Amino acid sequence: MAVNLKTMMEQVAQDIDRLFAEQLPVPEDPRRRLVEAMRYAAIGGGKRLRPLLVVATCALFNVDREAALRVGMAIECIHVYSLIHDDMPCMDNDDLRRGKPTVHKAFDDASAVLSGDALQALAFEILSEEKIHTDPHVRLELIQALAIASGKDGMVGGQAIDLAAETSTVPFDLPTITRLQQLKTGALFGFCLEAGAIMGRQNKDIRDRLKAYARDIGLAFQIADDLIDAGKATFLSLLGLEKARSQAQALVDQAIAHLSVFGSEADYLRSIARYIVA
Amino acid sequence: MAVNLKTMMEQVAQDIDRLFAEQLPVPEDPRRRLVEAMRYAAIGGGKRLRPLLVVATCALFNVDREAALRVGMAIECIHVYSLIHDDMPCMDNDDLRRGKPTVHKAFDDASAVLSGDALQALAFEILSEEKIHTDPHVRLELIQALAIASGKDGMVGGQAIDLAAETSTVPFDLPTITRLQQLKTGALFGFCLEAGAIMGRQNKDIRDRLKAYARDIGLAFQIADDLIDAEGDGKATFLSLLGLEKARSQAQALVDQAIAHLSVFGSEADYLRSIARYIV
Numbered sequence A: 001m002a003v004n005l006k007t008m009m010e011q012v013a014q015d016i017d018r019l020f021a022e023q024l025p026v027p028e029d030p031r032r033r034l035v036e037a038m039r040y041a042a043i044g045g046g047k048r049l050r051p052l053l054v055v056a057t058c059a060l061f062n063v064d065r066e067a068a069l070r071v072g073m074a075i076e077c078i079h080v081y082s083l084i085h086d087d088m089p090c091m092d093n094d095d096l097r098r099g100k101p102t103v104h105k106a107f108d109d110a111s112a113v114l115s116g117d118a119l120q121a122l123a124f125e126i127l128s129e130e131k132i133h134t135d136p137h138v139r140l141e142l143i144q145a146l147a148i149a150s151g152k153d154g155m156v157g158g159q160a161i162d163l164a165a166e167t168s169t170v171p172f173d174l175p176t177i178t179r180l181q182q183l184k185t186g187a188l189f190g191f192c193l194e195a196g197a198i199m200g201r202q203n204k205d206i207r208d209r210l211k212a213y214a215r216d217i218g219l220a221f222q223i224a225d226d227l228i229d230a231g232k233a234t235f236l237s238l239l240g241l242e243k244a245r246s247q248a249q250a251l252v253d254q255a256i257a258h259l260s261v262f263g264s265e266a267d268y269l270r271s272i273a274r275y276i277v278a
Numbered sequence B: 001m002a003v004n005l006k007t008m009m010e011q012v013a014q015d016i017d018r019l020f021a022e023q024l025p026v027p028e029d030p031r032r033r034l035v036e037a038m039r040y041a042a043i044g045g046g047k048r049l050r051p052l053l054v055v056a057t058c059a060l061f062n063v064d065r066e067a068a069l070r071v072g073m074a075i076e077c078i079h080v081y082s083l084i085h086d087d088m089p090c091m092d093n094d095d096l097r098r099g100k101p102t103v104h105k106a107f108d109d110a111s112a113v114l115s116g117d118a119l120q121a122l123a124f125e126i127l128s129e130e131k132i133h134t135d136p137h138v139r140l141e142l143i144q145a146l147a148i149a150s151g152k153d154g155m156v157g158g159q160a161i162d163l164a165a166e167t168s169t170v171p172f173d174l175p176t177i178t179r180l181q182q183l184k185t186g187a188l189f190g191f192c193l194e195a196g197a198i199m200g201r202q203n204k205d206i207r208d209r210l211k212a213y214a215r216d217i218g219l220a221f222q223i224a225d226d227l228i229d230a231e232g233d234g235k236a237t238f239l240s241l242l243g244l245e246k247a248r249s250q251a252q253a254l255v256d257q258a259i260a261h262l263s264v265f266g267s268e269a270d271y272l273r274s275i276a277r278y279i280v
């Protein structure tokens, strides 16, 4: 099961890379720097957790594979742009990323701002195209979901809470850092899973179960990260080492449990929760 | 015509303020600052030129007025976020915009980055809702058009060309600054006019006439801007390249050209006609 996953992963990574290169031809005009920055940030980089989730979820319902990949690129556009902006000096001020210089270092601050801005627009351009799905109602569902997942009630909202924690001398509580995770990383994860239910025209019960999986692995992910990282409150600082470890493991079990109404079609999502999140 | 135009402008301004206020409730969780930054930028502008164009174009056909206004809010999301990101120290460093301190000044740099980021997302959320149009294809057409108009092949692409001009010692030529305008400001104007055609379920011939109007007023607007800014005093501009007399006459000709695209409409197009003349 870990081998079928490790190879799904590689197929996904090379496909997303292909899609981005194809989506981002370098224009023969002064937009050259902008698009080269977009390609620099979007191509080659991450392990494509988000496109992977989209592909693995769409596989529950035998969704058109190609369209599933493009939805993957759309969510990855949002993820990548968020990283470009997060890395900037006024934010996390990071010099490196994938062992490679961040956009504002390789290019400049303004190029980082604009390349991120363009990638957000591109996510919606991609989702909007007819190749995604013939049912227009479907495409609208994906677009509304992504817009909510990306903005003030989603990823950016989470970024903002994180910024508030860093600039406040009042330590946050467990409910607030939980809400922080739900928005900062959980919104995009939730989109990945929900996109599958949408692409498959599934019912509320199935939609709810997939979003619960996303909810639970997202939290497990952050708890694990709060452990790996070792002044603001964290799951480690609030739960302590022992309970944080046990709660991360419990969340993984829970995430898998949400998929229990599925047969073996849900096996990729099971593996993702273990051999990646755990 | 200018009298009704002023009235429409004041009305659109009030409506857009109402709509943004309703769209942006302030949470008591730590997202408070983000949303207050969004409200600060979006509310109490602001001539709302882009909402005005949407409203005046939808008026050509039988489009629900509140729906037209919401599309106006959506395009204004893109415009406002673009100003927030443009004012930042990384870009133009403006501490002020029409007597109003910029977001990074009233708040901080990080809040300006995020409030702009959230506003771009908000534009697409707004367009996706059924409130806009019962027909799903109308909404999808608007969304596709906005994403193209906003990104690397639109507004941000234009922003990039401008940034390239400012950080190079090689003066751009007429073709390049023409492309610069088409993208930097022309793309959003194009959306405003095309949105009216889309909301009105209009044919390709009508859509093209409207986009041609946007193209012409957008160029005229930039030429007039190149003129205005010069009156109040080294990258190439329409003024530097064309010279004073040619830039003046071309701005004027472009207004006439913009209006001529509307010759197939009756008095319902008077707002758009006035707006074009106003852009001078």
Ligand SMILES: [Ca+2]
Pocket: B086, B091, B092, B162
């Ligand atoms: Ca600028």
